[PDB]
Amino acid sequence: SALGKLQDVVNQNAQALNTLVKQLSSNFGAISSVLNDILSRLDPPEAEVQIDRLITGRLQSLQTYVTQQLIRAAEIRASANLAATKMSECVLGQSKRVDFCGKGYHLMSFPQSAPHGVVFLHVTYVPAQEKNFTTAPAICHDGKAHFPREGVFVSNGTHWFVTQRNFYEPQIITTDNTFVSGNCDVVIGIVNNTVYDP
Amino acid sequence: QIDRLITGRLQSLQTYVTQQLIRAAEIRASANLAATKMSECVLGQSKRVDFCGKGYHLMSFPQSAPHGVVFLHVTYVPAQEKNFTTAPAICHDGKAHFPREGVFVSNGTHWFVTQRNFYEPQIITTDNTFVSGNCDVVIGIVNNTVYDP
Amino acid sequence: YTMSLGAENSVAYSNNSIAIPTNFTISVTTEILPVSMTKTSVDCTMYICGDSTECSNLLLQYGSFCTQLNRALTGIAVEQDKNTQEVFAQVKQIYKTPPIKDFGGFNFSQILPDPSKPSKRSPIEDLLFNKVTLAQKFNGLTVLPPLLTDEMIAQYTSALLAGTITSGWTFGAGPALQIPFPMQMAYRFNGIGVTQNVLYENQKLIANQFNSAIGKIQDSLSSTP
Amino acid sequence: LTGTGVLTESNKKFLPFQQFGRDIADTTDAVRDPQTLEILDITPCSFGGVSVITPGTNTSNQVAVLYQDVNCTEVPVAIHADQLTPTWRVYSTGSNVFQTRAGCLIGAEHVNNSYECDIPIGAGICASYQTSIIAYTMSLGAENSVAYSNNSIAIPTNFTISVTTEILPVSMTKTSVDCTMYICG
Numbered sequence A: 001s002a003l004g005k006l007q008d009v010v011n012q013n014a015q016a017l018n019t020l021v022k023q024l025s026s027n028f029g030a031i032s033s034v035l036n037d038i039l040s041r042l043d044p045p046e047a048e049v050q051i052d053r054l055i056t057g058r059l060q061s062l063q064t065y066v067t068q069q070l071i072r073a074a075e076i077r078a079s080a081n082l083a084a085t086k087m088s089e090c091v092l093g094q095s096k097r098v099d100f101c102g103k104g105y106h107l108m109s110f111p112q113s114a115p116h117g118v119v120f121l122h123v124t125y126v127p128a129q130e131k132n133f134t135t136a137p138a139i140c141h142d143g144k145a146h147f148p149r150e151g152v153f154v155s156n157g158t159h160w161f162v163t164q165r166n167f168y169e170p171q172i173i174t175t176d177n178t179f180v181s182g183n184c185d186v187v188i189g190i191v192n193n194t195v196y197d198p
Numbered sequence B: 001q002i003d004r005l006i007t008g009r010l011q012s013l014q015t016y017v018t019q020q021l022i023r024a025a026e027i028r029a030s031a032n033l034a035a036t037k038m039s040e041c042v043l044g045q046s047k048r049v050d051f052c053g054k055g056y057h058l059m060s061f062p063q064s065a066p067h068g069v070v071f072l073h074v075t076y077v078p079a080q081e082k083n084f085t086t087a088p089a090i091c092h093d094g095k096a097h098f099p100r101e102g103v104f105v106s107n108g109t110h111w112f113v114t115q116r117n118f119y120e121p122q123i124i125t126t127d128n129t130f131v132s133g134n135c136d137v138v139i140g141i142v143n144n145t146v147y148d149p
Numbered sequence C: 001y002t003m004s005l006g007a008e009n010s011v012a013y014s015n016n017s018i019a020i021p022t023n024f025t026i027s028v029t030t031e032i033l034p035v036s037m038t039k040t041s042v043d044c045t046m047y048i049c050g051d052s053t054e055c056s057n058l059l060l061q062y063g064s065f066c067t068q069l070n071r072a073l074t075g076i077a078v079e080q081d082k083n084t085q086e087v088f089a090q091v092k093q094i095y096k097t098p099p100i101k102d103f104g105g106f107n108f109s110q111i112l113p114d115p116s117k118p119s120k121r122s123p124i125e126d127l128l129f130n131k132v133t134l135a136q137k138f139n140g141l142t143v144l145p146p147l148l149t150d151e152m153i154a155q156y157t158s159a160l161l162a163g164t165i166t167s168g169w170t171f172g173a174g175p176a177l178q179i180p181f182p183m184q185m186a187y188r189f190n191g192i193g194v195t196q197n198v199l200y201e202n203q204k205l206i207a208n209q210f211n212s213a214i215g216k217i218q219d220s221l222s223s224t225p
Numbered sequence D: 001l002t003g004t005g006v007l008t009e010s011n012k013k014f015l016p017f018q019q020f021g022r023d024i025a026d027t028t029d030a031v032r033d034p035q036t037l038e039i040l041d042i043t044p045c046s047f048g049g050v051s052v053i054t055p056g057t058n059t060s061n062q063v064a065v066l067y068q069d070v071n072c073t074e075v076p077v078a079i080h081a082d083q084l085t086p087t088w089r090v091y092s093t094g095s096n097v098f099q100t101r102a103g104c105l106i107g108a109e110h111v112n113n114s115y116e117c118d119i120p121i122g123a124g125i126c127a128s129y130q131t132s133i134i135a136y137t138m139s140l141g142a143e144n145s146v147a148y149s150n151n152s153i154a155i156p157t158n159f160t161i162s163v164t165t166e167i168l169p170v171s172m173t174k175t176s177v178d179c180t181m182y183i184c185g
C-alpha cells in the first residue's frame, strides 16, 4: 500500500469514466435506450418526445462528469504546487522550516520519478544517547559574571565545562569561549568557579 | 406527475452536493494551513516574518475549540527608541575597522559599539572589530582610537 | 464620507543618523482557524421518493445517480477525520508536566489543564467552548459522530503544551531533552539577535509582562462577541 | 392527513383551536385525536445503515456487524431476520451485543483494555482481531514524564542518520469527450 496516494487518482478517474459509459444504457422515461428502435418502431412527429427525454438525460450525465473533473483537477493542482515548492526548497537548498523536509534536522533530499508523481528521500540527523548534567546560567569570577558564547555550562558532579548544545564535547572554561557583562549580583542561579586566562 | 416531482427533487440534491464539495475543499485548505502552523510555530521557532504573530517570534501555544484551533503567539516588540549618529567604519593607524557584529554609535562626543536591537554601548577594542584595507576607499569613515587590551 | 487609509508620518531620514531601541514589550496575540465540519449523510432514495414503491420503481430508470451522490458525501465525510488527525496527532508520546510548577516566575495556569473541574479543560479552553453554541430526523438525514472525542483532542493539546514547556524544541526532532525554562527563553532571545544577558538581567520584569499579557486574552475573547 | 410513524404521549399544549403542529422546515410532528382531544407526538420509524467489520479475507473469515444509530434491541425486527438465511440470523442476536454511541455492534466482545486504533468505528471506539473480534477505546500513546528540574539539562552523546520517503501526485490523464457523438451517435 506504499503508493496508495498515486493509485487512488487512477482508480477514481477510471471509475468516473466507467460510470459515464454505463449511463448510456438508461431509458430516462422513454421506451428504449437505443435511438434506432425509437425511430423504426414509432412515428416521426411523436418520436421527438422520447428523443428529447434521452437528450436531457445524457446531457445531465455529461454535466455532472465535467463538474467532478474540474473539482478534482483543482486538488491535483494544489498537490503539484506543493511538490514544486518541496523540490525547489528541500533539494536545491537546506531548509530550516521544521517538519517540512522529513522528521528531524534536515540535511539534504533526493528526487525520484513515479508514473504520475514524485518521491522525495529526505536525509536527516536525529540526536541519540542522551546523558544528564547539572547546569548554570553564568559563572562568577573576580566579581564578574561570565556567559558562554556558543554553548552551555555543564558539570559532571565536580568540574565545570563548556559544551556545544547538540553534541557532548566538554572543554575548559577560558576567556575566549566566554564573554563578560556586569557584576555578580543580578543573575539568579550564578555559581562560583575559575575562568582560566590563556 | 410522479416524474415531474422526481426531476426537481433530484436537481435539488445535485445542487446541495456540489456546494458541499466546494466548501469541503475550502475547509481542507484551512486545515492544511493549521497543520503547517502547528509544525512550524509550536514545535519550533519561526524565522519567516509575520507567519505567526506580529513582531519577532519567540514561541506559541495551542488550544482547542469546537471545530478548530486557537494559537497564542508570544512575540517580542522593540520599544522606547532614541536616535544617534553613526558611521560605517573607523580609521586608526591608516587602517579601516569594521564591527564584528553590531553598529558604531556616537552620543555626541564619544564613539561606542552596540548590538543592533538593544542599546548597550561598549568600548571599541580589537576584540569586537576586524580590519580590512586602508583608510581611502570607504565613504564616510571617521577618525577615532581603537583600544588594545 | 470618504475612506481614510491611516495616519501620516515622515521618518527622519538622514545619511548619518540611526535609531536604536532601549526597551521592549512582550505581546501575546490570538489566531483562530477552522479544521473540520459536521459529517452529514443523506440517503438519495428515501429523500426523493420516501416509502413509496411506485416512485422508487420510476426512479430506477435514471441509472446510478443516487449511488454516486452517496459516494461523494461519504468521501467528504471521511476527510474531516483526516483533517483533525493531521492537525492534532503530531506527538509520539503523552508528556506530563511536573507536579511542582516552579518555572522561574512564569505562570501558565490559564493555558494548562484544570484538574478540579470534570472536563479537564484549561481555563481559556472552557471559555471558548461556552462561547460557541448551536432521536431520528425525517427524510433520510443522518449525522455521524467524529472519531476523536473532544476529550482526546484536549489530551493532545495538553501533551503538546507540556512537551514545549518542559523540553523546548527538542521533542519535535528526536528524544525530548529537559532544559530549565529561564534558560530556554535565553536561547529564544539569542535566536532573534539579542544576547543572552538581556534576559537574565531583566528576568523578573520579563516574567511579569508575560503573565499580564496572558491575563488580558481571557477578557478580550470573552467581552468581544 | 396521512403518514407513518410512532405516536407517543406529548408534553406540549395546544390552544383550544389548533389541530396539529409543525416545526422549522414545516414538518408535521404533533397531532390531536378528534375523539379524545389529546396531543400526540410523531416520531419517524427507525432507519439507518449497516456496515461490516472484517479483518481481511487472507487472515480470517469472521465478521462483525454495525447497525448505525439504532437502539440495540430491535435489530432482529429492523432487518427481516425471520426471512434471511440461518447464517444471517446469527448476526441479529447473540452473546456479543454492544451498544456504542455509533450504534449497535454484533459479533465483537467489549474489553476494558486499551490499544492503538486498528479499525475505526467512532466516538473513540475501535475494533481489531486478536484470535476473535474485540472492540475497545483507543489509546493516544505511551505515557511519559520528563525529569524537569531548575538546574538539570540533558545532552546527546551520539547520533543517527535517517532516510524517509514522501510521495506526491502531480498530474492525471488527459481525457477528451466529444459531446455530439456521445449524446447522438
Ligand SMILES: *[C@@H]1O[C@H](CO)[C@@H](O[C@@H]2O[C@H](CO)[C@@H](O[C@@H]3O[C@H](CO)[C@@H](O)[C@H](O)[C@@H]3O)[C@H](O)[C@H]2NC(C)=O)[C@H](O)[C@H]1NC(C)=O
Pocket (backbone or CB within 6 Å): D157, D158, D159
Ligand atoms: C554511536 O553509535 C554507533 C552505532 O550507531 C556506535 O557504533 C557501534 O559500536 C558498537 C561497539 O563499538 C559496534 O558493535 C560491535 O562491533 C564489533 C566490530 O564489528 C563487532 O565485532 C561486535 O559484534 C559488535 O557488533 C557496532 O557495530 C557499531 N555500529 C556501527 C554502525 O558501526 C558507536 O560506538 C556509538 N558511539 C559512542 C561514542 O557511543
Ligand SMILES: *[C@@H]1O[C@H](CO)[C@@H](O[C@@H]2O[C@H](CO)[C@@H](O)[C@H](O)[C@H]2NC(C)=O)[C@H](O)[C@H]1NC(C)=O
Pocket (backbone or CB within 6 Å): A156, A157, A158, A159
Ligand atoms: C569529571 O571530570 C573531571 C575532569 O576531567 C574528572 O577528573 C579527572 O579524573 C581522572 C580519573 O579519576 C584523573 O586522571 C584526572 O586527573 C582528573 N582531572 C583532573 C583535572 O584532576 C572526573 O573524574 C570526572 N568525574 C567525576 C565524577 O568527577
Ligand SMILES: *[C@@H]1O[C@H](CO)[C@@H](O[C@@H]2O[C@H](CO)[C@@H](O)[C@H](O)[C@H]2NC(C)=O)[C@H](O)[C@H]1NC(C)=O
Pocket (backbone or CB within 6 Å): A140, A192
Ligand atoms: C562565591 O564566592 C564569593 C567570593 O568568595 C563569595 O562571597 C563571599 O561570601 C561570604 C559568605 O557570606 C562573605 O563572608 C564574603 O564577604 C563574600 N565575599 C565577597 C567578596 O563578596 C560567595 O559567597 C560565593 N558564593 C557562594 C554561593 O558560596
Ligand SMILES: *[C@@H]1O[C@H](CO)[C@@H](O[C@@H]2O[C@H](CO)[C@@H](O)[C@H](O)[C@H]2NC(C)=O)[C@H](O)[C@H]1NC(C)=O
Pocket (backbone or CB within 6 Å): B107, B108, B109, B110
Ligand atoms: C557620552 O558618553 C560619555 C562616555 O560615557 C560621557 O562622558 C562621561 O560623562 C560623565 C558625566 O559625569 C563623566 O563622569 C565621565 O567621566 C565621562 N566619561 C569620560 C570617558 O570622560 C558623556 O557625558 C556622554 N554624553 C555626552 C553628551 O557626551
Ligand SMILES: *[C@@H]1O[C@H](CO)[C@@H](O[C@@H]2O[C@H](CO)[C@@H](O)[C@H](O)[C@H]2NC(C)=O)[C@H](O)[C@H]1NC(C)=O
Pocket (backbone or CB within 6 Å): B091, B143
Ligand atoms: C583623520 O586623520 C587623518 C590622519 O591624522 C587626517 O589626515 C590628514 O589630513 C591633513 C589635512 O588634509 C593632512 O595635512 C595630513 O597629511 C593627513 N595625515 C596623513 C597621515 O596623511 C584626516 O584629515 C582626518 N580626518 C578628519 C575628518 O579630520
Ligand SMILES: *[C@@H]1O[C@H](CO)[C@@H](O[C@@H]2O[C@H](CO)[C@@H](O)[C@H](O)[C@H]2NC(C)=O)[C@H](O)[C@H]1NC(C)=O
Pocket (backbone or CB within 6 Å): C022, C023, C024, C205, C208, C209
Ligand atoms: C522598560 O519598560 C518597563 C515597563 O514596560 C519599565 O518598568 C516600569 O517602570 C516604572 C517606573 O520605574 C514602574 O512604575 C512600572 O511599574 C514598571 N513596569 C513594570 C511592568 O515593572 C522599565 O523601567 C523600562 N526600562 C527602562 C530602562 O526604561
Ligand SMILES: *[C@@H]1O[C@H](CO)[C@@H](O[C@@H]2O[C@H](CO)[C@@H](O)[C@H](O)[C@H]2NC(C)=O)[C@H](O)[C@H]1NC(C)=O
Pocket (backbone or CB within 6 Å): C107, C108, C109
Ligand atoms: C498564576 O496566576 C493565577 C491567576 O492570577 C493565580 O491564581 C490566583 O491566585 C491568587 C492567590 O492564590 C488568588 O487570590 C486568585 O483568585 C487566583 N486566580 C484564579 C483565577 O485562580 C496563581 O496563584 C498564579 N500562580 C502562582 C504560583 O502564583
Ligand SMILES: *[C@@H]1O[C@H](CO)[C@@H](O[C@@H]2O[C@H](CO)[C@@H](O)[C@H](O)[C@H]2NC(C)=O)[C@H](O)[C@H]1NC(C)=O
Pocket (backbone or CB within 6 Å): D034, D035, D036, D037
Ligand atoms: C366521543 O364519544 C364518546 C362516547 O361516549 C365519549 O366517551 C366518553 O367521554 C366521557 C367524557 O366526556 C368519559 O367520561 C367516558 O368515559 C367516555 N366513554 C366512552 C365509552 O368513550 C367521548 O368523550 C366523546 N368525545 C368527544 C370529543 O366528543
Ligand SMILES: *[C@@H]1O[C@H](CO)[C@@H](O)[C@H](O)[C@H]1NC(C)=O
Pocket (backbone or CB within 6 Å): A132, A133, A134, A155, A156, A157, D147
Ligand atoms: C541524572 O539523574 C539522576 C536521577 O534522575 C541523578 O541521580 C543524577 O545525579 C543526575 N546526573 C547528574 C550529573 O546530576
Ligand SMILES: *[C@@H]1O[C@H](CO)[C@@H](O)[C@H](O)[C@H]1NC(C)=O
Pocket (backbone or CB within 6 Å): A188, A189, D150, D151
Ligand atoms: C532551584 O530550586 C531550588 C529549590 O528546590 C532552589 O534552592 C534553587 O535556588 C533553584 N535554582 C535556581 C537557579 O533558581
Ligand SMILES: *[C@@H]1O[C@H](CO)[C@@H](O)[C@H](O)[C@H]1NC(C)=O
Pocket (backbone or CB within 6 Å): B083, B084, C012, C017
Ligand atoms: C535626532 O537626534 C538629534 C540630536 O541632536 C535631534 O536634534 C533630532 O531631533 C533627532 N531626530 C528625531 C527625534 O527625529
Ligand SMILES: *[C@@H]1O[C@H](CO)[C@@H](O)[C@H](O)[C@H]1NC(C)=O
Pocket (backbone or CB within 6 Å): B139, B140, C015, C016
Ligand atoms: C551626508 O550628507 C552631507 C551633506 O548634507 C555630506 O556632507 C556628507 O559627506 C554625507 N555623508 C556621507 C557618509 O556621505
Ligand SMILES: *[C@@H]1O[C@H](CO)[C@@H](O)[C@H](O)[C@H]1NC(C)=O
Pocket (backbone or CB within 6 Å): D056, D058, D059
Ligand atoms: C494478509 O495480507 C495482509 C496485507 O496484505 C498482511 O498484513 C497479513 O499479515 C496477511 N495475512 C497472512 C495470513 O499472510
Ligand SMILES: *[C@@H]1O[C@H](CO)[C@@H](O)[C@H](O)[C@H]1NC(C)=O
Pocket (backbone or CB within 6 Å): D071, D072, D073
Ligand atoms: C434502548 O432500549 C432499551 C430497551 O427498552 C431501553 O431501556 C433503553 O433506555 C434504550 N436506550 C436508548 C439510548 O435508546
Ligand SMILES: *[C@@H]1O[C@H](CO)[C@@H](O)[C@H](O)[C@H]1NC(C)=O
Pocket (backbone or CB within 6 Å): D112
Ligand atoms: C471491565 O469493566 C467493567 C466495568 O466496571 C466491570 O464490570 C468488569 O468486571 C471489568 N472486567 C471485565 C473482564 O469485564
